[PDB]
Design a protein around this ligand. Structure first.
Ligand SMILES: CCCCCCCCCCCCCCCC(=O)SCCNC(=O)CCNC(=O)[C@@H](O)C(C)(C)COP(=O)(O)OP(=O)(O)OC[C@H]1O[C@@H](n2cnc3c(N)ncnc32)[C@H](O)[C@@H]1OP(=O)(O)O
Length: 86
């Protein structure tokens, strides 16, 4: 793992706003892969925007490598910074 990623996790959660879905979706899938990996949970079903989008976005990366997902995750947090603050 690469702690800077977790640090990014704190930092992103500090964003004075909850970013737009796409940006959220990226952080979510990247964080979910970066930490969990092979999605093995269920499909929310009930909700779409917050249930399938964020599950789908992660299923779409089901077999990735932590560290990479971290770089992109963190780099996304950096991108967010510009738009939302951090
Ligand atoms: C529309 C579809 C995509 C977005 C769906 C919503 C969830 C997206 C998670 C990705 C990160 C979102 C960051 C938004 C928050 C900010 O950027 S700063 C926000 C100021 N806003 C508010 O106070 C209102 C919104 N706040 C929140 O959502 C936070 O209070 C939050 C709940 C994130 C605090 O986290 P915590 O209480 O510690 O844990 P959970 O409540 O379990 O976290 C919520 C979901 O996010 C996943 N998660 C946890 N930590 C991270 C990091 N670092 N990156 C990405 N995702 C993270 C949790 O797993 C949970 O999702 P899930 O398990 O999929 O249901």
């Amino acid at each position: 793992s690469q702690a800077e990623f977790d640090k990014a996790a704190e930092e992103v959660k500090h964003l004075k706003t909850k970013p737009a879905d796409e940006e959220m979706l990226f952080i979510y899938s990247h964080y979910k892969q970066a930490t969990v990996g092979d999605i093995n949970t269920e499909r929310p079903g009930m909700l779409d925007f917050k249930g399938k989008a964020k599950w789908d976005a992660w299923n779409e990366l089901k077999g990735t490598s932590k560290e990479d997902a971290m770089k992109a995750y963190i780099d996304k947090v950096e991108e967010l910074k510009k738009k939302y603050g951090i």
